[PDB]
């Protein structure tokens, strides 16, 4: 059976299971069941399933090199699908809540969930909450007597928290740390002294890399009972690296990719985002350019936003990007190499992820 | 050591642990640490700790009748405190998010967390997320090799989901189920055909009773390894009952308790809440009263809200309340009785909860 076909089938099974359990154990009525079904489809379907499918692809890899009965192969593949869906639903949770937090308009060329006329922020905050509880209902039901249950839940829990800590670093990234105070409305930074590579790297690592890269790879290993074909410090380093690279590209596209293709009008300039472009720009600008940057950044006035774009184009950031890219390629290949010692299968799955990321 | 003193001490220890782990493992900086410390104190302290302290009080009960070394007594009491705090933090999560959802103004005579000038909805949604992840960080750290870890996490997870399902029943309680549709803005009900005792009881059971009553009692039993001194169906029924009673009283106070004492201006009338008062009023009104109810309910126009209050006063709802109260007292005492078979200690703790609730 092809992997996508399995993964999509498992969605319909898990949806049926969750909705049926609401009826049999939570006294739900059909109209509310239908609301949550539509919620689930609208927030969880329609992407490329990179994160979910990685869990499946990692598991498929170990299946080729490990002796198993047929029924075990199926159980492993089914576990990989459910685990994959746990990450997609985790992602959907974060996307629903982030869009509300940020006052976002569109997501995947369609309106954000909270904007749907019969949803509203009042319901959508809680719909996002339910998405994440669904990930745990899946794990407890499907993996009830799996040996990996404890480790899986512990990992998931750590990644979730990292993500939320990351979101916090992200939403406060235009503030001066020394001014943060729940009592005092927060001004945007004037100096941009916290627009550094290290500070940037901290936001992306917590906000994105743990749930996008670390979680699917390690979940793959857990459902395959293969945590011992790898050096966990290595899997960490390579994920944080591929993950960083991922965010550099979406920081670049937020700026220089028409809103048609982005599936979203970019507002990193006007949100005064600590993006790779602003940081890298500030690491190479002369004094007159830094002053012009500061006079325009974080302003919706389209004219000021077109000034920030001008400065980035002028400053030749594509050269910095290709330099970054060359170094990331170096480091990723070296890490892949170090992964091949213990597992060529796992190293090949990390190679396949990095490819999809790069292209 | 007195129980409150222990419980508050354990707060300072758990706060220190969580903040220290952010620094040592999540690369946090001191100013963000201070933000989250203030967040934690402002959202989690200041209440009566009924839910948290019940876990402690249940555990104290079994300590009197069970042979244990001193070090075990302390470990059990310490576990009860941490578990208690897991419920307070769960509650804080729900209060932070509900206040945002509902556009609430005050909570405990102080502004809702999201209203604080240096917070904003953008941060407060995520602060609420962190509150709930903190409950899991506590459990995994403090209860890492406890035999009850699995059961505790499973229970907590079920209660959390129930609560979120409950919130959903609550936020959609003024809609007609047959009209719910994420595509179509939701009108308030015209007929009030879903303002029934059964429908009311469904909202309160999911929204409140699981986290407020079931969770503290069962968590008490789990940390005491005493799940076998009770009949779990009984503990369920008595909690759902005391819990329902709880909501009937706060539905009454939302209306007839000055905002000074409530710690919050009530808006159940103008939110068109399925409260006990509206339901009970509709179960006894004549046709002219139902029509007047319908012409005023769910409207901020204070004059219309004063009409709804008039109708409730006229309709003699206090008599219905005392009738309800007499029946709840009957049923609770009968359940206590059925609990005494297996455990007089547990039955006495359920007696102590019901007292605090009643008074
Ligand atoms: C585990 C994992 C996670 C994310 C990705 C990924 N995300 O976006 C892309 C493709 N973005 C190109 C088309 C610009 N690949 C791949 C693997
Ligand atoms: C386990 C648990 C949970 C809640 C309560 C409770 N809540 O509020 C009150 C007191 N409300 C009176 C002063 C009107 N008792 C008690 C025990
Ligand atoms: Zn965001
Ligand atoms: Zn972006
Ligand atoms: Zn509410
Ligand atoms: Zn209320």
Automatic annotation (TrEMBL), chains A, B:
Q: Which residues bind Zn(2+) 5?
A: 236
What positions does the entry give for Zn(2+) 9 binding?
250, 268
GO CC annotation terms, alphabetical: cytoplasm
Q: Which residues bind Mg(2+) 4?
A: 250, 254
* Chain residues that bind Zn(2+) 3: 102
**Which keywords does this Swiss-Prot/TrEMBL entry list?**
Magnesium, Membrane, Metal-binding, Transferase, Transmembrane, Transmembrane helix, Zinc
**Which residues does the record give as Zn(2+) 2 binding sites?**
98, 102, 170
Which GO terms label this protein's molecular function in UniProt? (2E,6E)-farnesyl diphosphate synthase activity; dimethylallyltranstransferase activity; metal ion binding
Where is Mn(2+) 2 annotated to bind? 102, 170
Q: Which residues bind Mg(2+) 2?
A: 102
The positions annotated for binding Mn(2+) 4 are 250, 254
Positions bound to Zn(2+) 8: 250, 254, 268
Q: Which residues bind Zn(2+) 1?
A: 98, 102
| Binding of Zn(2+) 7, residues | 250, 254
Q: Where does Mg(2+) 3 bind?
A: 250
Binding of Mg(2+) 1 occurs at: 98, 102, 170
Q: Which cofactor does it need?
A: Mg(2+)
Q: Which family does it belong to?
A: Belongs to the FPP/GGPP synthase family.
The protein depicted here goes by the name Farnesyl diphosphate synthase
Q: What is the lineage of its organism?
A: Eukaryota, Discoba, Euglenozoa, Kinetoplastea, Metakinetoplastina
Q: Which residues of the full protein are shown?
A: 64 to 422 of 425
